[PDB]
């Protein structure tokens, strides 16, 4: 029965609830995704407000939507779970009716649509979540990375970041990512990604979690150690000078 | 004072006024002008159409509801679409179910009732458009004036919109004259045009400006736009 | 009639006369050839002076009368005493609107001061017919001739009880689905009188 | 937060203002009523005040015939009283249909009280501004008086009064019952009980009544009925002999 | 028209307080004192019959109600809210239990059921909490005797003895001193009578007091003989006379 | 507070008026109608240089003979486009013909005022008006090339040329002066390009502006960057003359 | 109209925080503290009782430790009644999963479902959130012993040791100090009780003020055993540890 | 505090429902209409204001029939009155369908009363902005009723509402005092036209049109008919006569 218009225009043409949803995103951990020539890497900083967690179980920040597409987010954890489930279900429904898994653009368009619907339906508040969705289209090798926000707007990015301090790391990427020589290797792509999160995370190994996604359902979550090896090699292309 | 008693149509003021309805009556007052007048054989609607820029079309004001009924609008157009659509349906029901043409008096009664429902319940909003309905039924020619408050009145002639009071006086004077233009369609129209031209100010009525509709004895509701109103300026 | 349910069979009639109207009925219900109840009461009160004779399905007619009694009790509470024509309309509304699932032949008889006695018969389809007297029930077929020949308008109470007593005994005689005692309910300005007649009397008439 | 006085939610002191205000409304009509029980009857008296001369005196009543057996007198605005009346009539009839016997006065009272309680708890329904005194001669209980209010409260009474001068009447009645030591008027005819009733309302309000100033209802075994003007006068004419 | 009130009327205030529940607890505080004492072979629930006039018939207002033949309830707060809660409790005892398992529910579960109805009024759209606290006393084969208190929030807790309403604080105090786990029912009734005496303002007698016990099975109150598995209800309301006889041995 | 379908003292629906303000903060969209086709051009306006511009969809195909440009809260237009496409196809199914452009537009505008909280009249569930406006352009055999501006008020006007978005007052002004009953498709493309160039914040190039047209012969075609760049170049040269 | 009285329980503050969620958290911060400590061979759940007395029956009580399955139990911090509503739906989801797959429900699955329910009251419906935070102690064949926690926002996380309710900052600081990855259950019990002993808002920690539970896999059996300590068992374990 | 008058069903501290009372004000700003009960019928009359000469004379009928024996006239917001009559019609039909006999006047009154009162129970609906005078002939007599926005109604000997209500009620009290015997429908028609004319003085700035109708066992057969032709002019003349 509850259908009060919670998202409405104010005198200046802004939808407050959608704008306040962006603020909740600004408060979430940073997430970044940059794409290589044959890969897409997703980095996420870990919430350090409280520590003594059990890393094994705790809901990871990067989630598999299907064997070839993943989604990371910044915003209300609880809210992200609702978007993730609907995307997973739509991913299986698409396989069932079209006899082909979703392209990344389609999946993005679907999640984005769900977010927009919550901006103009009665009785519900928008999702305090922005997402990064990446993977590869079936039988294709060109990497894809898309970003969606609470308004439901979406688009693709060579590299992009969301979350707290995203403004700062966005700047780093804006002048360290060249579309003439995008990180031609998994190694250098992860490097650049780590470099970017380092400019904000403040010297922390376990503080960063990377996930590398290659063509044909090859997705691997690098280990604390494998990343640490990157932080070290990075503090070298900073200390030798 | 006001923001206390003017937030919902469901609220009566201390003096017994319904502000939302009154605010609805205002949107009509900023709409372009339209005139309605009838003799004992024809009823005509003349309406001044208004544009947004000199690069746009002139929004239609007249809508045919059946072969024997139609109306001109002033105010929120979408609302006119909603209401004329209801009229189209009711007219249709009468023909299909009873093989009877809907009486204008009946059409008016139905419009009143539809508008009233939107003035007694919370969450809704009154319609913000006025309509002049003309039709020729079993009792002759008719002109009706519909207001969003739900008040429908049958008249000899009238006008609504900005500066309506101008044409409303010409007709109020010309009554004895036009009520007798029987068997002469073009005259009635001319009378209507003369009436409408008493509420002008901005420009003179042109071929892109005028819109006339006529219905009567052996004339099914027909709308004359642009090209064919040249002979009335 | 549903398979195996109790049937009223019956010989029922309602006759108007000078002082008012009288309802009469036999008292047998059956399930096949077994007499489930040999002393039933088919004269049902739906209002102080508005009664009915029931025939067809025992279940259906009881359900319907129970509902009518309620509608008239509520009507009374709000608008005062209901006319017999109103009581009939309620019965009809139920019988007609539910014709596919019911088997109710009902005769409605009542007494008013403005209208004197009135009789309405609601046959199987739910149509309503006002008449000077009506007969129904499975036993009614056997007395169409007798009743048409002997009924007179404006008879006296004594005469009407006799007419109803003779007709029903004949009906009971020929119809295996009718029998028992003959019950009558006299509805006049004076009140409501209940009469009962046993076999040893009516059988040898 | 401050709207706790417009809808039925608790005020910081645990009060339901809307219910309190519904109680003030029951006095809007400035009419007083009382009910007493005879040995085998229950009488309710209610003042009748017809101001405007343009009115049809026969249609101004606050006493309702709920069922063949139950009568109800209402203290409060007429539209709410008639709303309550219709519902009580529907409930009594439904009860008889479903359960096979006439609904008792006290059960109807309880049912009507439960309904009021709901308006007290759900914010969308407003309380009805009325007090309902149901009376009858119950088949199990005898003469009965059960009265309900906007709070959803109800209870049975030996005798009761309601209206602006409720306290004076109640005290007069309490005094009579303390003096006599019984829970009912020891008279055999409802006529005398009606007389007692009127006498004590006169004594208590310090006012003299004429036939068109009272409204009377009597409940006896198997029936409840209102008295006509002329019956009331026979009553008045008879009281003008003890006093 | 229509209940467009589909939102909560009880919400969390900045301090983490649920306004409406606190206010309902206050309403309860102004109510007449009711208590319950749990003995080794029974439980007693008692309350005072605050008659709002002497013309009113106190007996026709049962503040102590039987919910099932082995369970009774008393309260403090808004009488009408209680009356509807009793109706609903008596009903749920049948719908969520007797019609499923063929036996009346155990005290804690009936309590849990009443408590749930109360919680929903604390969160469901368009309603205010109930302004009452109940003391439910009962018995069941597997748990013996118990006494529970249910608050407007829907929280319930078991007690050895407790009191609620107006003089609850002083009463709980008197109870803490007199209570011990070797009390026979008669002694609890006695203590209940004493405890109630200090809460009561004027006349204290069988006609102004309501006391009910949950004790031994009463065959004389079954209504029939022949089936030996059901031996009678354990709930019994003490009569006006039964209370006075015990008041004299004060 | 105050209702969503409330009328102001001036007889304007608050939400609708506030909706039109959000539209003034969106990228410019320009459509120009000639007798050889209708051109629609839009300003991409990316929020940062890392955004792959081609993923910015502001000109969409409704059907082979109808295309449309948007401006405002672009996400709100996705449900609108969906309805527009479904309406055009459904009409083809029911009538074995192309839907008229006016009809397509009217159908779209019928959605507009369908917002509110139980607004007594019919069932309108959408908590607020759309925050985007559309330029609908197309061709049909009865009325030829047409361009329509569909607003959240539910009203739509046919225009010979029209600009919507942040730079519309300025752009509309240039349009008023540059449009004439005998423009060519190429002339139109140029003007859209020129006017877009004027009101945009950034320098107009083939990566931040998009052209498209709709013609009887080829239907709706979004101009690929290469075709547009040649046009932008062709512009720099025509302007640098006098 | 009715809008007037609507508190708007599911809106964002200008800072992107959920009013009602933040406020419920505050309510929760006044509830008896509950602690859950995960060992290599078991899990301990301990809770301090709120609103008590000399007359409260402790034997027949449970207001903080509830069994959801024979393998999963929770500790409650917040409104007991709100908790009971959620608990009953969790107990049903568990049985729903068992019926469907014929395997006991994995702990995280049950936890995420409960959290999603809480999240719902957060995004739609217009009803107030549930003022409850849970500590779930459970075992399953995929991850073994697990400890989770969920709060009014519907967010949940996993822990080696955690506390909810009053004085969490204080308790968490103490746990983080004495906790070691290789702890044995007997050790965790002590730690649990010690921590409570120092964070209590009351005089001294006594048996009548606690609820205690452990989920161990007794080596002389196989089925995991959930033990909800009875009054006399809490008094006993309290002496051995040295609180008296 | 204040605000008790912004939402319908709300009781003010003095037990009044302010929104209903403001409805009454909309009634007092409207045309006067009356009703006179006679020895075997009822007569209704209403003043219709002539906003301008463009109004086709005698076409905007205001009095309405219900079934075939009830007349209804009201003052205030005309549309609300129509709404009320539409319901009355559905209510009268319902009664006839189930009970066969046309709806008794007292029963019809209550049907209208209950619906109007229903609109004072919730804040989601606005009360009726009209007072309705209606009545007719049934099984036992003529009946005249007047219903207010509160849903209040009673039976009358004469009734009037609208701006000139006082003058009308004044003249009505005269008639009832002088003719206790009853008044022939004929005389009542005349007297009604008079009362409206006199009452018209309470709004003497606009020209008017008289509308009368009646229901009489002897003149119309217990059916409602409008006063047309000879009979109307006779009443119009008798009016302009007794004015000076
Ligand atoms: Mg036989
Ligand atoms: Mg309420
Ligand atoms: Mg309300
Ligand atoms: Mg008055």
Curated annotation (Swiss-Prot), chain A:
Keywords: Cytoplasm, Nucleus, Phosphoprotein, Proteasome. The modification Phosphothreonine is found at residue 58. GO terms for cellular component: mitochondrion; nuclear outer membrane-endoplasmic reticulum membrane network; nucleus; proteasome complex; proteasome core complex, alpha-subunit complex; proteasome storage granule. The 26S proteasome consists of a 20S proteasome core and two 19S regulatory subunits. The 20S proteasome core is composed of 28 subunits that are arranged in four stacked rings, resulting in a barrel-shaped structure. The two end rings are each formed by seven alpha subunits, and the two central rings are each formed by seven beta subunits. The catalytic chamber with the active sites is on the inside of the barrel. Interacts with CIC1. The proteasome degrades poly-ubiquitinated proteins in the cytoplasm and in the nucleus. It is essential for the regulated turnover of proteins and for the removal of misfolded proteins. The proteasome is a multicatalytic proteinase complex that is characterized by its ability to cleave peptides with Arg, Phe, Tyr, Leu, and Glu adjacent to the leaving group at neutral or slightly basic pH. It has an ATP-dependent proteolytic activity. Belongs to the peptidase T1A family. This is Proteasome subunit alpha type-4. The gene is PRE6.
Swiss-Prot record, chain C:
It holds the Pfam family Proteasome. InterPro entries: Ntn_hydrolases_N (IPR029055), Pept_T1A_subB (IPR000243), Proteasome_bsu_CS (IPR016050), Proteasome_sua/b (IPR001353), Proteasome_suB-type (IPR023333). Keywords: Acetylation, Cytoplasm, Hydrolase, Nucleus, Protease, Proteasome, Threonine protease, Zymogen. CDD domains: proteasome_beta_type_6. GO terms for cellular component: cytosol; nucleus; proteasome complex; proteasome core complex, beta-subunit complex; proteasome storage granule. It catalyses: Cleavage of peptide bonds with very broad specificity. One of its GO terms (molecular function) is endopeptidase activity. The keyword NAD does not apply. The active site is at 10 (nucleophile). It is found in: Cytoplasm; Nucleus. SUPFAM superfamilies: N-terminal nucleophile aminohydrolases (Ntn hydrolases). Its main location: cytoplasm. Signal peptide: none annotated. One of its GO terms (biological process) is proteasomal ubiquitin-independent protein catabolic process. Its EC number is 3.4.25.1. Belongs to the peptidase T1B family. Present with 7250 molecules/cell in log phase SD medium. This is Proteasome subunit beta type-1.
Swiss-Prot record, chain D:
The keyword ATP-binding does not apply. One of its GO terms (biological process) is proteasome-mediated ubiquitin-dependent protein catabolic process. The modification Phosphoserine is found at residue 228. It comes from the Eukaryota. InterPro entries: Ntn_hydrolases_N, Proteasome_alpha, Proteasome_alpha-type, Proteasome_asu_N, Proteasome_sua/b, Proteasome_subunit_alpha6. GO terms for cellular component: mitochondrion; nucleus; proteasome complex; proteasome core complex, alpha-subunit complex. Keywords: Acetylation, Cytoplasm, Isopeptide bond, Nucleus, Phosphoprotein, Proteasome, Ubl conjugation. CDD domains: proteasome_alpha_type_6. There is a cross-link at residue 223 (Glycyl lysine isopeptide (Lys-Gly) (interchain with G-Cter in ubiquitin)). Pfam families: Proteasome, Proteasome_A_N. It is found in: Cytoplasm; Nucleus. The proteasome degrades poly-ubiquitinated proteins in the cytoplasm and in the nucleus. It is essential for the regulated turnover of proteins and for the removal of misfolded proteins. The proteasome is a multicatalytic proteinase complex that is characterized by its ability to cleave peptides with Arg, Phe, Tyr, Leu, and Glu adjacent to the leaving group at neutral or slightly basic pH. It has an ATP-dependent proteolytic activity. Present with 15200 molecules/cell in log phase SD medium. Belongs to the peptidase T1A family. This is Proteasome subunit alpha type-1. It comes from Saccharomyces cerevisiae (strain ATCC 204508 / S288c) (Baker's yeast).
From Swiss-Prot, chain H:
Keywords: Acetylation, Cytoplasm, Nucleus, Proteasome. GO terms for biological process: proteasomal ubiquitin-independent protein catabolic process; proteasome-mediated ubiquitin-dependent protein catabolic process. The alpha and beta forms are probably products of the same gene with different post-translational modifications. It is found in: Cytoplasm; Nucleus. One of its GO terms (cellular component) is proteasome core complex, alpha-subunit complex. Signal peptide: none annotated. Disulfide bonds: none annotated. GO terms for molecular function: mRNA binding. The keyword Cytoplasm applies. Transmembrane segments: none annotated. The proteasome degrades poly-ubiquitinated proteins in the cytoplasm and in the nucleus. It is essential for the regulated turnover of proteins and for the removal of misfolded proteins. The proteasome is a multicatalytic proteinase complex that is characterized by its ability to cleave peptides with Arg, Phe, Tyr, Leu, and Glu adjacent to the leaving group at neutral or slightly basic pH. It has an ATP-dependent proteolytic activity. The 26S proteasome consists of a 20S proteasome core and two 19S regulatory subunits. The 20S proteasome core is composed of 28 subunits that are arranged in four stacked rings, resulting in a barrel-shaped structure. The two end rings are each formed by seven alpha subunits, and the two central rings are each formed by seven beta subunits. The catalytic chamber with the active sites is on the inside of the barrel. The gene is PRE10. The chain holds residues 5 to 248 of 288 of the full protein.
């Amino acid at each position: 029965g509850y259908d009060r218009a919670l998202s409405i225009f104010s005198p200046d043409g802004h939808i407050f609830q959608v704008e306040y949803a962006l603020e909740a995103v600004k408060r979430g951990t940073c997430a970044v995704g940059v794409k290589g020539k044959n890969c897409v890497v997703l980095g996420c900083e870990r919430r350090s407000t409280l520590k003594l967690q059990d890393t094994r179980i705790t809901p990871s920040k990067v989630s598999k939507i299907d064997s070839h597409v993943v989604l990371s987010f910044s915003g209300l954890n609880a809210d992200s779970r609702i978007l993730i489930e609907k995307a997973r279900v739509e991913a299986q429904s698409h396989r069932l009716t079209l006899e082909d898994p979703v392209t990344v653009e389609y999946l993005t368009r679907y999640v984005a649509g769900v977010q927009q619907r919550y901006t103009q339906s009665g009785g519900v508040r928008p999702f305090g979540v922005s997402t990064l969705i990446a993977g590869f289209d079936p039988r294709d090798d060109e990497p894809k990375l898309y970003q969606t926000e609470p308004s439901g707007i979406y688009s693709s990015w060579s590299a992009q970041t969301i979350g707290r301090n995203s403004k700062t790391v966005r700047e780093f990427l804006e002048k360290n990512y060249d579309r003439k020589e995008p990180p031609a290797t998994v190694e250098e792509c992860v490097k650049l990604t780590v470099r970017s999160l380092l400019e904000v995370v403040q010297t922390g190994a376990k503080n960063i979690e990377i996930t590398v996604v290659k063509p044909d359902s090859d997705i691997v979550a690098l280990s604390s150690e494998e990343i640490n090896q990157y932080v070290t090699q990075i503090e070298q292309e900073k200390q030798e000078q | 004072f006001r923001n206390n008693y003017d937030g919902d149509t469901v609220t009566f003021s201390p003096t017994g006024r319904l502000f939302q309805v009154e605010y609805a009556l205002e949107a009509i007052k900023q709409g372009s002008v339209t005139v309605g007048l009838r003799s004992n054989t024809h009823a005509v609607l003349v309406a001044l159409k208004r544009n947004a820029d000199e690069l746009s079309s002139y929004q239609k004001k007249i809508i045919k509801c059946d072969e024997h009924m139609g109306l001109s609008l002033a105010g929120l157009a979408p609302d006119a679409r909603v209401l004329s659509n209801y009229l189209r349906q009711q007219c249709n029901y009468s023909s299909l179910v009873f093989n009877r043409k809907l009486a204008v008096e009946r059409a008016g009664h139905l419009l009143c009732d539809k508008a009233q429902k939107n003035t007694q319940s919370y969450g809704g909003r009154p319609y913000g458009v006025g309509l002049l309905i003309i039709g020729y039924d079993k009792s002759g020619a008719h002109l009706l004036e519909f207001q969003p408050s739900g008040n429908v009145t049958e008249l000899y002639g009238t006008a609504i919109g900005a500066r309506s009071q101008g044409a409303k006086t010409y007709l109020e004077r010309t009554l004895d004259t036009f009520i007798k233009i029987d068997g002469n369609p073009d005259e009635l129209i001319k009378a209507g045009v003369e009436a409408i031209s008493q509420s002008l100010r901005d420009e003179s009525l042109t071929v892109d400006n005028l819109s006339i509709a006529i219905v009567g004895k052996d004339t099914p509701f027909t709308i004359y736009d642009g090209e064919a109103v040249a002979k009335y300026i | 009639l549903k398979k195996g349910e109790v049937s009223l069979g019956a010989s029922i009639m309602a006759v108007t006369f000078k002082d008012g109207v009288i309802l009469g009925a036999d008292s047998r219900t059956t399930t096949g050839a077994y007499i489930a109840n040999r002393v039933t009461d088919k004269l049902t009160r739906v209002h102080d002076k508005i009664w009915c004779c029931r025939s067809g399905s025992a279940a259906d007619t009881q359900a319907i009368a129970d509902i009518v009694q309620y509608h008239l009790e509520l009507y009374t509470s709000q608008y005062g005493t209901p006319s017999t024509e109103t009581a009939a309309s309620v019965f009809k509304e139920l019988c007609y609107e539910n014709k596919d699932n019911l088997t109710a032949g009902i005769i409605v008889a009542g007494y008013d001061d403005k209208n004197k006695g009135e009789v309405y018969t609601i046959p199987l389809g739910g149509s309503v017919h006002k008449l000077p007297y009506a007969i129904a029930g499975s036993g009614s077929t056997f007395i169409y001739g007798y009743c048409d020949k002997n009924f007179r308008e404006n008879m006296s109470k004594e005469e009407t009880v006799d007419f109803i007593k003779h007709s029903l005994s004949q009906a009971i005689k020929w119809d295996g689905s009718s029998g028992g005692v003959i019950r009558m309910v006299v509805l006049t300005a004076a009140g409501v009188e209940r009469l009962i007649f046993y076999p040893d009397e009516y059988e040898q008439l | 937060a401050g709207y706790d006085r417009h809808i039925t939610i608790f005020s910081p002191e645990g009060r339901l203002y809307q219910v309190e205000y519904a109680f003030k409304a029951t006095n809007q009509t400035n009419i007083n009523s009382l009910a007493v029980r005879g040995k085998d009857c229950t009488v309710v008296i209610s003042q009748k005040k017809v101001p405007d001369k343009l009115l049809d005196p026969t249609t101004v009543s606050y006493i309702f015939c709920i069922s063949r057996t139950i009568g109800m007198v209402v203290n409060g605005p007429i539209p709410d009283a008639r709303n309550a009346a219709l519902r009580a009539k529907a409930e009594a009839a439904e009860f008889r249909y479903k359960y096979g016997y006439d609904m008792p006065c006290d059960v109807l009272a309880k049912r009507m009280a439960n309904l009021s309680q709901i308006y007290t708890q759900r914010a969308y329904m407003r309380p009805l501004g009325v007090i309902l005194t149901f009376v009858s001669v119950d088949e199990e209980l005898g003469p009965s008086i059960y009265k309900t209010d906007p709070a959803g409260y109800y209870v049975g009474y030996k005798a009761t009064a309601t209206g602006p001068k409720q306290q004076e009447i109640t005290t007069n009645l309490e005094n009579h019952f303390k003096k006599s030591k019984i829970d009912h008027i020891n008279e055999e005819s409802w006529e005398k009980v009606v007389e007692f009733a009127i006498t004590h309302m006169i004594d208590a309000l310090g006012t003299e009544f004429s036939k068109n100033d009272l409204e009377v209802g009597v409940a006896t075994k198997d029936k409840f009925f209102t008295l006509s003007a002329e019956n009331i006068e026979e009553r008045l004419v008879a009281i003008a002999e003890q006093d | 028209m229509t209940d467009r009130y589909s939102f909560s009327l009880t919400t969390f205030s900045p301090s983490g307080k649920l306004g409406q529940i606190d206010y309902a607890l206050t309403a309860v505080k102004q109510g007449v004192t009711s208590l319950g004492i749990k003995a080794t072979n029974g439980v007693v629930i008692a309350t005072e019959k605050k008659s709002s006039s002497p013309l009113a018939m106190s007996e026709t207002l049962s503040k102590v109600s039987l919910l099932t033949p082995d369970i009774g309830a008393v309260y403090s707060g808004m009488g009408p809210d209680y009356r509807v809660l009793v109706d609903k409790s008596r009903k749920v005892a049948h719908t969520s239990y007797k019609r499923i398992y063929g036996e009346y529910p155990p005290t804690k579960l009936l309590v849990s059921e009443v408590a749930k109805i109360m919680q929903e009024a604390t969160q469901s759209g368009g309603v205010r909490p109930f302004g009452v606290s109940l003391l439910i006393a009962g018995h069941d084969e597997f748990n013996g005797f118990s006494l529970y208190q249910v608050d407007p929030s829907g929280s319930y807790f078991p007690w050895k003895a407790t009191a609620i309403g107006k003089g609850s604080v002083a009463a709980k105090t008197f109870l803490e001193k007199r209570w011990n786990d070797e009390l026979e029912l008669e002694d609890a009734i006695h203590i209940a009578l004493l405890t109630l005496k200090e809460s009561v303002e004027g006349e204290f007698n069988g006609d102004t007091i309501e006391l009910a016990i949950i004790g031994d099975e009463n065959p004389d109150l079954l209504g029939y003989t022949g089936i030996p598995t059901d031996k009678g209800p354990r709930f019994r309301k003490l009569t006006s006379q039964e209370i006075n006889d015990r008041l004299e041995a004060l | 507070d105050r209702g969503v379908s409330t009328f102001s003292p001036e007889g304007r629906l608050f939400q609708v008026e506030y909706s039109l303000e959000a539209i003034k903060l969106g990228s410019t969209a320009i459509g120009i109608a000639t007798k050889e086709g209708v051109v629609l051009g839009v300003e991409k306006r990316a929020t940062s240089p890392l955004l792959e511009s081609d993923s910015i969809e502001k000109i969409v195909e409704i059907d082979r003979h109808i295309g449309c440009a948007m401006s405002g809260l672009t996400a709100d237009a996705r449900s609108m486009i969906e309805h527009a496409r479904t309406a055009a196809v459904t009409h083809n199914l029911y009538y074995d013909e192309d839907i008229n452009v006016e009809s397509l537009t009217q159908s779209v505008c019928d959605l507009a005022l369908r917002f509110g909280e139980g607004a007594s009249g019919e069932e309108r569930l959408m908590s607020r008006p759309f925050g985007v406006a559309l330029l609908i352009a197309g061709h049909d055999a009865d009325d030829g090339y047409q361009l329509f501006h569909a607003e959240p008020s539910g009203t739509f006007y046919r225009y010979n040329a029209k600009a919507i978005g942040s730079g519309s007052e300025g752009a509309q002004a240039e349009l008023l002066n540059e449009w004439h009953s005998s423009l060519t498709l190429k002339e139109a493309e140029l003007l859209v390009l020129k006017i877009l160039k004027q009101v945009m914040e950034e320098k107009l190039d083939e990566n931040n502006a998009q052209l498209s047209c709709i013609t009887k012969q080829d239907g709706f075609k979004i101009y690929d960057n290469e075709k547009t760049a040649e046009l932008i170049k062709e512009l720099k040269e025509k302007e640098a003359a006098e | 109209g009715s809008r007037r009285y609507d508190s708007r329980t599911t809106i964002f503050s200008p800072e992107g925080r959920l009013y009602q969620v933040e406020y419920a958290l505050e309510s929760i911060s006044h509830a008896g503290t509950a602690i859950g400590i995960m060992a290599s061979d078991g899990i301990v759940l301990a809770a301090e009782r709120k609103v008590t007395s000399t007359l409260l029956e402790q034997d027949t009580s449970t207001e903080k430790l509830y069994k959801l399955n024979d393998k999963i139990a929770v500790a409650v911090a917040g409104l007991t009644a709100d908790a009971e509503i959620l608990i009953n739906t969790a107990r049903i989801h568990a049985q729903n999963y068992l019926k469907t797959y014929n395997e006991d429900i994995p702990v995280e699955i049950l936890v995420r479902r409960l959290s999603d329910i809480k999240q719902g009251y957060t995004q739609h419906g217009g009803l107030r959130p549930f003022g409850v935070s849970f500590i779930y102690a459970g075992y399953d064949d995929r991850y073994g012993y697990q400890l989770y926690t969920s709060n009014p926002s519907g967010n949940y996380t996993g822990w080696k040791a955690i506390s909810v309710g009053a004085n969490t900052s204080a308790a968490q600081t103490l746990l983080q100090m004495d906790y070691k990855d290789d702890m044995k259950v007997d050790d965790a019990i002590e730690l649990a009780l010690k921590t409570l002993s120092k964070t209590t808002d009351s005089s001294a920690l006594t048996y009548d003020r606690l609820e205690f539970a452990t989920i161990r896999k007794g080596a002389n059996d196989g089925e995991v055993y959930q033990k909800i300590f009875k009054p006399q068992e809490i008094k006993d374990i309290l002496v051995k540890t040295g609180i008296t | 505090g204040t605000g008790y008058d912004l939402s319908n069903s709300v009781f003010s501290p003095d037990g009044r429902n302010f929104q209903v009372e403001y409805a009454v004000k909309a009634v007092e700003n409207g045309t006067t209409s009356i009703g006179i009960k006679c020895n075997d019928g009822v007569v209704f009359a209403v003043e219709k204001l002539i906003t301008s000469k463009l109004l086709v004379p005698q076409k905007n009928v205001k009095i309405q029939v219900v079934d075939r024996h009830i007349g209804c006239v009201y003052s205030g917001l005309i549309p609300d009155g129509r709404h009320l009559v539409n319901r009355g019609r559905e209510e009268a039909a319902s009664f006839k369908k189930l009970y066969k006999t046309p709806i008794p006047i007292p029963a019809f009154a209550d049907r209208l009363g209950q619906y109007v009162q229903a609109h004072t129970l919730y804040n989601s609906v606005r009360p009726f902005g009209v007072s309705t005078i209606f009545g007719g002939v049934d099984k036992n007599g003529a009946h005249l009723y007047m219903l207010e926005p509160s849903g209040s109604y009673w039976g009358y000997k004469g009734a009037a509402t609208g701006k000139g209500r006082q003058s009308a009620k004044a003249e009505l009290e005269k008639l009832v005092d002088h003719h206790p015997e009853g008044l022939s429908a004929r005389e009542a028609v005349k007297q009604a036209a008079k009362i409206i004319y006199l009452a018209h003085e309470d709004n003497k700035e606009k020209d008017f049109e008289l509308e009368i109708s009646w229901c009489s066992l002897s003149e119309t057969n217990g059916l409602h008919k409008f006063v047309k032709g000879d009979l109307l002019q006779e009443a119009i003349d008798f009016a302009q006569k007794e004015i000076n």
